[PDB]
Each structure stands twice: as C-alpha cells, then as structure tokens.
Design a protein around this nucleic acid. Structure first.
Ligand code: K
Ligand code: K
Ligand code: K
Ligand code: K
Ligand code: MG
Ligand code: MG
Ligand code: MG
Ligand code: MG
Ligand code: MG
Ligand code: MG
Ligand code: MG
Ligand code: MG
Ligand code: MG
Ligand code: MG
Lengths: 83, 127, 151, 99, 114, 101
RNA sequence: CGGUCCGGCCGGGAACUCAAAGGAGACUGCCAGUGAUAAACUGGAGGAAGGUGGGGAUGACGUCAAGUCAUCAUGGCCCUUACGACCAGGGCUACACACGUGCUACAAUGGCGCAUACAAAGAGAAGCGACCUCGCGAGAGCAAGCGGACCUCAUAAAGUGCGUCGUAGUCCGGAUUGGAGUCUGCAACUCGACUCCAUGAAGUCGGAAUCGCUAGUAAUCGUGGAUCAGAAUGCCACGGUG
C-alpha cells in the first residue's frame, strides 16, 4: 500500500468534480476514469460511474467503501463458466 | 636460517618456513589443532613429516590464504614438501614415490552456455 | 567405454584406523559430499560395535563383511534368439563393493533412531549371520544355483 | 611532492611503449622515478544471443580488457613536470595525472 | 493444564505448548513466557499454579481463540458484503492475492475435476 | 521499429528534461518531506500530478540507437544484441573481441 | 630488523604471496620390448605436467523449400479521411482443464538456538553508500569515502563445538488467508517486491514410463552480474565440500 508518509492519493481532476457534486448533491452520476483514485469520506453518498475499459459502471459510495480504490468496484474481465 | 616453500592447491596458496626446532607448528599464528577442526587436514599436514620421520626435529611457521579447508590443507602439504626438499634434496626421490611433489592441477571446470553446470545438461524430452 | 581401460583413482586411507576399505565404506555412506558427517557416523557405529563384540573396530567390521560378501552373481548372457541368466564368479574387489553397498542400503532403510545405531545394528546382525544384508547375499546365491544349468 | 600517473589502454603493447616513453623522457630530464607498476587488468564480459529469432542456446561471448599502468615521479623538478606535460600519446591511451 | 485459551496443553515445553492457543505463534509464545517469568525449557508438567495462573493472566492480554476467529470471519464477511474484487475472489473460491490461474492455484481451487 | 515509436520516444526524452530534471524538488524535497507541514506536502502531491505525464523518466523505453529495437538492449554500447555483434565482428568497437577461458 | 597503543599499524625491506609484461618447459625428446630393418603400440626414467596434460574458441561440401518479411534490408502485392497518427482506461496476469522446464518438501546423514572458522569472481556517479542515531523488521535521518589492488556493495553458506526435539503429519513442510507496514513511481484496485503478527493445506520417497553425468564430474552450499525507477525459483558467471 502507499507509504504512510505520503497520505492517500486522489486525482485532482476527480476531486474538482467531487467538490461541485457535493455542492449540488450528486444531482447526476459523476463519470470518471480515475479507477486508481481513493474513496475519500467527502465522496460518501455520491454515485460515480467508474470506467471498466468499455463501459461506465455505477458505484454508489456506501460509507463502508471509504479508503478503497474506486477500481475495486468495477471488474474488468468477464467470466461465466467454460461450458 | 629459514628453509622455504610455496605450495598451492585449488585456489589456496601457502607459504611454509621450516627451521630446526622442537616440533612446533603454527599456521596464521594459530595452532594446527586450533586452525583445522577436521582430522583429514590434521593428517595430511603431517603426512610428509611422518614419512620423513622428522616430526620431532623440525618446527615450522606457515601462512595460508584462499580456498576452503581442504584446499589450504593440500596447499600446506605441498609447501611443506617443497621446503623440506630444499632442506634435504636427497629426500626428493622418496617424496616422488610419496606422490606429494605433484602439484595437483584439478581446478574447477567453468560453467558453459546452454548447460546448467560444468556438464549437467537440462532435462531432455522427446515430446 | 569401448576404446579405453581405466587405471584406478588414488584413494586415501582412513585417518583413524589406516584402512582403505573403511575409507571406501565411508565414501559409500557419504551423501552430498558431506564426508565428515559420514566419518562421524562410521566412527560411532564402529566403536559401539567394538564394545558389543569385544573386538577391535576393524576386526568386528571385517568379520561382519565376511558374512555378506557374495561368491557368485547372475549375469544376462545373450544368444542368437534368447537371453539366459548365467552365474559368474565375482572378483574380490567387486565382492567388497557389493557387501558394503548391501550393508549401507540395508541400514539406511531400518527404523532405528539414528543412522549410527541403524548401522551398528545391521553390522551386528551381519556378524550374527542374520538380517537383510545376509538374506540379500543368500537369495543371490539361491538364484545363481537355480540358474546353474546354463553355466 | 610526488606526481602520479595512471595509464589506461586496450593494448598492453601500446601501454607498454607509452610507459617506456614516460620513463625514458623523465630520466633524461633528471626525474627520480618509482617504476611502472602493473595494476590488475579490469575486464568486462558480455553474452549475446546471435540468432535474430529464438535459439536461446546459440550465443557468443565477448570480452574487453582494460590494461592499467601506474608510475610515480618521486622528485618532479620543474623541467620534468613540464616535459611530462608536453608529451602526446596515441588515442588508445588515456593518461590521468595527480599530485 | 488449560489456559484462558480454552484448549488443554500438556507434556511439552511451554514455548511450544502455548502455540496450541489459536492466535499464539512462536514470538507471542516467547513474549508471554518472558512476561510471565517462566523459562522456555520448562515443561507444563512440574509448572507451578502460581505460574499457570500468570500464564493465563498474560495470554488474556491478546485476542485469541473465538475472539480472533470471529474477527477474522467478520472481516471476510465484510468483503463479501462490499462486493469488492477481493470479495468476489473470496465468495468464488479463487486466489485473492493475484496468483496464477492458468494452472497451480490447486490449494485454493481444490482437487482437479474433469 | 515503427517510425512513430521513434518520434514518441525522442519526444518523451526531450520533455523529461524540461520538467522533472528541474522540478524534482517538488517530490524529493516536499512530497517526501517529513520536517515540513502536511498541508504543504499535500499541496505538492496534488501539484505533481499536474505535470505532463510523459515528463516522468520512468516512462522512457530506452531503445537501441541504430534500429529502435526495445528488447535486448545493452547499456554499455547503446545497441541491441544484433547490431552490437554486427559492429563487433566488423571491428567498429574499439576493444571488443571474442573471449575464451 | 628498530618502535608499538598488538593494528602491516609505524619506521623499514623488495625477501614471500600477488599484480602482469617478457622468456623457458612436453617433443614420443630419452630407454627397453613388440612390429614388416616401417608407421606406431606396451612398460620405464626424468619432470609441475606424458602421450590431443585439462578447458574454451574454431563447425568442410551439403541436407531439412528448417527459423526469421516483427531487429534490419528488399522484389512483388495491398491501405492512403485509413491496415497511417495522438490520447485515457482495459488486456497480454482470465481458468473446466492437459503437457513441458524448474523451485521447496515429505525429515534425525535433520529442525531450532548460541558461539566461531575458511572463498572466488564482479559492479559503482540520474551511482555504490560507510560510521553514528531511530525502528522487532523491511527501512528512515545524518553523512565519510570511491570513476576505485585504496572507498561502498559485503560478517559467504555448507562446516566445527554445545544444548534441545524423539519418529509424531511433529519444534517436519510453509502453500492459503486476515490484520499492520516499508520502498520505488504521476500512480502498486485489475497487477509489484519486501517486512512484522496470526493462520499452518497437500505431502510420509511418488503408476505405466523417463532424464543427466566418466573427476575436481555428479550431488550438494553460498556469492556476483545483465535487463532494470521497482520487479528472478529464469539466464550468464564464481568459488567451498566432494
Ligand atoms: K496456534
Ligand atoms: K516485403
Ligand atoms: K522455477
Ligand atoms: K533490479
Ligand atoms: Mg528441447
Ligand atoms: Mg522501464
Ligand atoms: Mg582444429
Ligand atoms: Mg516453410
Ligand atoms: Mg508475421
Ligand atoms: Mg494506452
Ligand atoms: Mg505472456
Ligand atoms: Mg515419519
Ligand atoms: Mg565423455
Ligand atoms: Mg560448483
């Protein structure tokens, strides 16, 4: 995990949108490609449409999700049995 | 004055000085029995003086470097045999018979490309 | 080899008892080049066998080895359309090699609490004309005499 | 004070004649010199696969040997250090100097 | 004997015997014995009651047995409730920490089946 | 290698010198800092993400100079295992020759 | 040899090891026997080495329409608002399974703990990083030295001595999984390495079958390097026991 010296990581271009989304009240799902960004507490109760490689997947930020990376909630590979 | 021999074995080299005296042996300022813990080394370092039967009439100061236990033990035996042939050349015909004069040339064989070792080839399969 | 014949490599006698035969025995019990481990095991086994037997170490070892050295072995001999087992008078150096190999491999597979003690037990049994090394010698002789018709 | 010269080259004969020139000119100039010492020959080994494709076991192995020589001018009088500054050598020699 | 860890150690050196307590490895075992003031070589047999009592008292400072078990389970439960990638790997019985799955992973997948 | 790959690589190599070679202070002095306030460290962390991503030296591929091949590069010569041998046997490398021992 | 603080550390020596330029030595040269007054074979002397002394490089004419148009070059063909070019995210890391090459084991010729011996060969400036302080540890702070026979990487491990375990799925084995961290990097979710705590699978020498090796070899034990911000159980080298 990221070195505790540095503190958790978020992308600026996502944070700028989380800000105005909190001001607006998550009026619409916030599309993002920052799968690597960490879920900060200010994000709780927002819906972020995280890219998965071909689609944006709605994640509803439950309070239990804090401190995980967004991408952990958007699986990238499809499997459904061999036969 | 000192009588001298250089000897070597594998990567180990030894300088041996021998002089008349009451049988003392010293290696790197340590006793023979302190420097070597293995009985084979303790035997091979004596072998030449045992066969010459002078173990109680000569003393020797040794330094040895490089290689492991047996390399240094053989290097010391070789240096001892050279030095004592310098002390008494008439013993050479005996030491030749003892086989000590031969500088053992069995160096380690270098690794070769495509082989795991000197000669160990990778496992082969027909298919 | 088909071109060459090889002169034997120089062995060094055992440092404590002066025996090249005991040196060969050590060299057979040795594993992974851990010579000094094998030496320690052999010396412990020989001293305990000595105190059991009331014999010198080399004497007890020799009288044990006498009981297991084979006199004949079976060799596959080809014929223009068949193969037969035929008994052959094994030569003394191979006799010693076989006896030492059989002793060692018999001891190795014993259950006793240490290799030195396994070895001491197996040498006692061999000197007592009993046990796995002896039954190995025995069945070799049985097979030889069962094939004697082709000799 | 002394001055100390290290020569490096890829040819022991070139480095040889360079040291010979140094020593001869210096002693002709009245220098006291402590003679050329051969330092250990640092050598680089490389291994390359020589096929354009596959054939991992087909390889060539190459080496570069760097020869070194050390020489000390133990009484560098003005004319000797001047002359030693004036010398030129073949490009195969690197000369590095210290005081 | 028996300890605040509900199990029953016996007939063994204390430094090993304590490791029967679910949650106590070798270094915890040593820390327990150091703080209890007991020589690691001493068997549980011929151990004083004024020593087993303090062994209990010292082990009581660590989360062990059911306390640990449920905690571990709870954490795993949480992941499966989150539905995070790790939660999927857990519920689906596959390797969680990025091991190969072309082959191997046979401890996790369990015995092969055609 | 595809000519675009060469242009792309040289673009990255040039761009890296315009920033991180100078503004490395932003990470090494501040984002790594322990002796200084966490608010400044946070601001520096956020600022570093604003530099053009291709300016990171960690993104340079280090291709062979004569053909742009990525694999089999040798850092002593700047050449791939192929071109290095071609030059070697033609004697263009000033001290290299076949080894034996 | 003088001095010493016991440290080649000091004056000192150029002896010895070593560094590395040059030269010598091995030739069936010498001596019996065999052989076709042959070429050469057997044994012996001397020598460090004896019969290609050991190892490497060195690969004839050609076979397989063998491998590579994706290192590169090139005939022909095809695209030229796309089969060309830029960007973010994802994939090459999937997982019912089957095969190849390896690593670690199944233990007492051993595991654990304490002490203490003996290597070679390499790398270092967008580098190797000492001492000292902090941390259980990975590491952090400060900062000497080194473009190096000088400084750093860097206390080799097997081993030797002593104790303990007692044939147990164990004080064997360490996969899997939870928790807490370090470091590199814009960034370790998919998808890094490593450290600490906990957990402690299968496995008790492996069916038909099959592979390597002739001596400093096999087996076994450590060390280094290239690629490289980070990221070897692979590859290329080294020495110890043998
Ligand atoms: K436990
Ligand atoms: K073409
Ligand atoms: K492997
Ligand atoms: K690396
Ligand atoms: Mg193959
Ligand atoms: Mg890179
Ligand atoms: Mg030839
Ligand atoms: Mg074809
Ligand atoms: Mg193609
Ligand atoms: Mg991309
Ligand atoms: Mg792949
Ligand atoms: Mg068992
Ligand atoms: Mg052969
Ligand atoms: Mg080796």
């Amino acid at each position: 995990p990221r070195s505790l010296k540095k503190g958790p990581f978020i992308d600026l271009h996502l944070l700028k949108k989380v800000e105005k989304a909190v001001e607006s009240g998550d009026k619409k799902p916030l599309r993002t490609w920052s799968r690597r960004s960490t879920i900060f507490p200010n994000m709780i109760g927002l819906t972020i449409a995280v890219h998965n490689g071909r689609q944006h997947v709605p994640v509803f930020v439950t309070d239990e999700m804090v401190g995980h990376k967004l991408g952990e909630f958007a699986p990238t590979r499809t499997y459904r049995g061999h036969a | 004055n000192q009588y001298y021999g250089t000897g070597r074995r594998k990567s180990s080299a030894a300088r041996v000085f021998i002089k008349p005296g009451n049988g003392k042996i010293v290696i790197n300022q340590r006793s023979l029995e302190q420097y070597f813990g293995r009985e084979t080394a303790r035997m091979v370092v004596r072998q030449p003086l045992e066969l010459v039967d002078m173990v109680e009439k000569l003393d020797l100061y040794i330094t040895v470097k490089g290689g492991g236990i047996s390399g240094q033990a053989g290097a010391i035996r070789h240096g001892i045999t050279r030095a004592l042939m310098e002390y008494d050349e008439s013993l050479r015909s005996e030491l030749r018979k003892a086989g000590f004069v031969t500088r053992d040339a069995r160096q380690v064989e270098r690794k070769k490309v495509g082989l795991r070792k000197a000669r160990r080839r990778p496992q082969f399969s027909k298919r | 080899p088909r071109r060459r014949v090889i002169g034997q490599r120089k062995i060094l006698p055992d440092p404590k008892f002066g025996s090249e035969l005991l040196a060969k025995f050590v060299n057979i019990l040795m594993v992974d080049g851990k010579k000094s481990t094998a030496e320690s095991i052999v010396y412990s086994a020989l001293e305990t066998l000595a105190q059991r037997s009331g014999k010198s170490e080399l004497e007890a070892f020799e009288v044990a080895l006498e009981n297991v050295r084979p006199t004949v072995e079976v060799k596959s001999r080809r014929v223009g359309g068949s193969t037969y087992q035929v008994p052959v008078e094994v030569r003394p150096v191979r006799r010693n090699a076989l006896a030492m190999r059989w002793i060692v491999e018999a001891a190795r597979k014993r259950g006793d609490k240490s290799m030195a003690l396994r070895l001491a037990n197996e040498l006692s049994d061999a000197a007592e004309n009993k046990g796995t090394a002896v039954k190995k010698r025995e069945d070799v002789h049985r097979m030889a005499e069962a094939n004697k018709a082709f000799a | 004070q002394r001055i100390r010269i290290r020569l490096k080259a890829f040819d022991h004969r070139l480095i040889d004649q360079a040291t010979a020139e140094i020593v001869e000119t210096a002693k002709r100039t009245g220098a006291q010199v402590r003679g050329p010492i051969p330092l250990p020959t640092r050598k680089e080994r490389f291994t390359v696969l020589i096929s354009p494709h596959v054939n991992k076991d087909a390889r060539d192995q190459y080496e570069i040997r760097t020869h070194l020589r050390l020489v000390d001018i133990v009484e560098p009088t003005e004319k000797t250090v001047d002359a030693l500054m004036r010398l030129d050598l073949a490009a195969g020699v690197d000369v590095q100097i210290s005081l | 004997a028996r300890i605040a860890g509900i199990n029953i150690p016996d007939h063994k050196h204390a430094v090993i015997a304590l490791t029967s307590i679910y949650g106590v490895g070798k270094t915890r075992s040593k820390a327990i014995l150091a703080a209890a003031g007991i020589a690691e070589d001493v068997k549980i047999s011929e151990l004083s009651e004024g020593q087993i009592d303090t062994l209990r008292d010292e082990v009581a400072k660590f989360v062990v047995e059911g306390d640990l078990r449920r905690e571990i389970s709870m954490s795993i439960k949480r992941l499966m409730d989150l539905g995070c990638y790790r939660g999927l790997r857990h519920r689906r019985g596959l390797p969680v920490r990025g091991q190969r799955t072309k082959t191997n992973a046979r401890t996790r997948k369990g015995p092969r089946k055609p | 290698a595809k000519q675009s790959m060469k242009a792309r690589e040289v673009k990255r190599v040039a761009l890296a010198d315009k920033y991180f070679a100078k503004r490395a202070e932003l990470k090494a002095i501040i984002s790594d800092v322990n002796a200084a306030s966490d608010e400044d460290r946070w601001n520096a962390v956020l600022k570093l993400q604003t530099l053009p991503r291709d300016s990171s030296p960690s993104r340079q591929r280090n291709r062979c100079r004569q053909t742009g091949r990525p694999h089999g590069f040798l850092r002593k010569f700047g050449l791939s295992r192929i071109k290095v041998r071609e030059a070697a046997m033609r004697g263009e490398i000033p001290g290299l020759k076949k080894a034996s021992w």
